[PDB]
Amino acid sequence: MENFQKVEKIGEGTYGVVYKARNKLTGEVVALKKIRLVPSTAIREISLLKELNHPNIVKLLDVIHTENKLYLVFEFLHQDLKKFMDASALTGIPLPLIKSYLFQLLQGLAFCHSHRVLHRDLKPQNLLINTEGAIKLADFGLARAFGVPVRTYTHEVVTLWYRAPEILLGCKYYSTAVDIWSLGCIFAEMVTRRALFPGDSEIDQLFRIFRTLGTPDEVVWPGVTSMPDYKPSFPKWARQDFSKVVPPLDEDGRSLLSQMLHYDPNKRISAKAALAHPFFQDVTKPVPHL
Ligand SMILES: NS(=O)(=O)c1ccc(-c2ccc(/C=C3\SC(=O)NC3=O)o2)cc1
């Protein structure tokens, strides 16, 4: 890591602490993640992720395994979507830019998922934007590569807000549908400027989903009632109208949102099918203010 000088701490993610760093030789500016953890399995899986390249994924530039420590060197981008959404809390992100961001993120997901790689932990903090109007998925593949956690190294309440309902009901063998769910939630949030399902615990997370989309049953989700953490004793709320949930959004957008928020992960739209949705007939690539 001595080939790097630390500039600033960009944050403390699930996998330890991220610094903006300068490669003390090249002059190149990067994001340096020291992994807070040596297992051979993780090294191989991490090495496989280095070959994933797509303009919508933040590039894993170098994997440095030294002094039994793991450093991950990532392409550095200047902002994430959280700060960008905070900055424009008062005006709104204009819809064409929302749409552009949604279309490119789904492209990232289509690519990753075509490789059987999933994120599992998408959130606005993982979505990185530049001045050219690009948006990129960070931390793809890391969950499966390293193992999946409770509270972070920051001793921080991590984000269940974007968690798919099959994960919350204790499914061990979930699929790429979990990422579409999370993107669905982030799409809604961009539109309304408020988190769609801001749970303060796992059952509150699940109940906030139930209260808006209705309590799932065998009709909408075959197999639901025999999932590990499902309880017959769950309250039985009715589904709300999406015109109430993401109120200003047009019918193309809400129809797409609804396919991304299907309970049944096999009914839930693929990233590839979502790219052909009518919402994107008029997509463009606007550039943000920044
Ligand atoms: N809060 S901020 O908008 O100033 C900001 C946040 C993140 C990054 C940034 C650039 C590159 C990375 C790499 C990341 S983010 C993550 O969650 N895991 C990474 O490796 O993170 C830059 C600015």
Side-chain angles (χ1 to χ4, degrees), residues 1-23 25-35 38-290:
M1 83 155 286
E2 58 267 52
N3 331 63
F4 294 99
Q5 182 58 72
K6 291 173 174 197
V7 180
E8 207 191 342
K9 164 166 68 185
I10 335 177
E12 217 247 45
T14 294
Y15 312 97
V17 69
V18 196
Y19 299 85
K20 178 186 186 171
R22 193 180 347 286
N23 196 298
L25 307 136
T26 288
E28 201 196 340
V29 162
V30 303
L32 224 216
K33 215 194 269 265
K34 176 209 183 286
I35 299 296
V38 77
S40 47
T41 280
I43 309 290
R44 312 184 174 93
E45 174 71 42
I46 277 315
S47 307
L48 245 18
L49 292 173
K50 214 181 320 142
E51 339 284 30
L52 254 44
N53 293 153
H54 181 94
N56 300 117
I57 315 283
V58 167
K59 200 208 188 158
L60 178 49
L61 304 169
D62 297 299
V63 170
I64 312 166
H65 182 27
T66 16
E67 237 99 45
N68 308 65
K69 306 213 252 172
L70 197 43
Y71 293 91
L72 289 277
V73 178
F74 287 102
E75 160 193 6
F76 173 84
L77 280 80
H78 284 83
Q79 284 222 356
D80 70 41
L81 185 56
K82 181 169 169 159
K83 173 175 178 181
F84 186 71
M85 295 192 282
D86 296 342
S88 68
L90 288 104
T91 152
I93 306 162
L95 180 74
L97 186 58
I98 299 194
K99 183 176 306 204
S100 172
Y101 281 171
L102 191 64
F103 186 84
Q104 305 175 51
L105 288 179
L106 283 165
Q107 281 181 248
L109 294 199
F111 175 83
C112 289
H113 295 166
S114 77
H115 282 95
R116 308 262 59 86
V117 173
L118 57 105
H119 191 105
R120 212 225 73 126
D121 180 20
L122 292 181
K123 51 187 157 304
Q125 285 87 336
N126 282 171
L127 307 175
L128 298 185
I129 58 163
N130 66 26
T131 45
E132 312 251 293
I135 183 151
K136 323 213 180 171
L137 293 152
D139 297 358
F140 252 83
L142 298 194
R144 154 178 173 184
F146 292 119
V148 223
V150 256
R151 271 221 286 171
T152 55
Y153 185 49
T154 18
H155 14 257
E156 177 207 278
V157 274
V158 85
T159 302
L160 335 148
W161 292 5
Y162 305 95
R163 215 169 267 169
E166 59 276 26
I167 302 180
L168 296 167
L169 291 165
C171 174
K172 314 183 234 321
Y173 312 100
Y174 44 78
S175 72
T176 54
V178 298
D179 295 328
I180 292 287
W181 182 275
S182 316
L183 191 50
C185 297
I186 300 172
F187 178 29
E189 183 163 352
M190 275 198 295
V191 171
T192 72
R193 314 165 230 169
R194 228 190 139 147
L196 178 55
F197 299 128
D200 87 307
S201 67
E202 300 162 44
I203 202 59
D204 184 62
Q205 189 68 36
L206 208 44
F207 295 176
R208 288 177 187 277
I209 299 162
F210 292 7
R211 273 186 255 154
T212 295
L213 318 172
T215 299
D217 54 25
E218 287 299 330
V219 178
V220 292
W221 193 351
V224 68
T225 73
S226 68
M227 288 207 276
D229 304 331
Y230 174 93
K231 312 296 168 162
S233 65
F234 280 162
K236 284 173 244 329
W237 288 286
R239 182 180 184 88
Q240 306 310 257
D241 234 273
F242 270 46
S243 63
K244 183 86 179 313
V245 189
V246 287
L249 190 54
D250 71 57
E251 183 68 76
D252 284 320
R254 315 195 301 248
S255 153
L256 210 213
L257 181 60
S258 96
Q259 301 180 113
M260 299 177 85
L261 295 180
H262 278 157
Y263 266 119
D264 182 348
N266 306 104
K267 292 187 182 75
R268 192 177 301 153
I269 203 183
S270 65
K272 150 111 157 64
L275 290 165
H277 189 281
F279 187 56
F280 301 117
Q281 226 175 344
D282 70 348
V283 72
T284 55
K285 195 180 170 161
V287 305
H289 182 64
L290 300 205

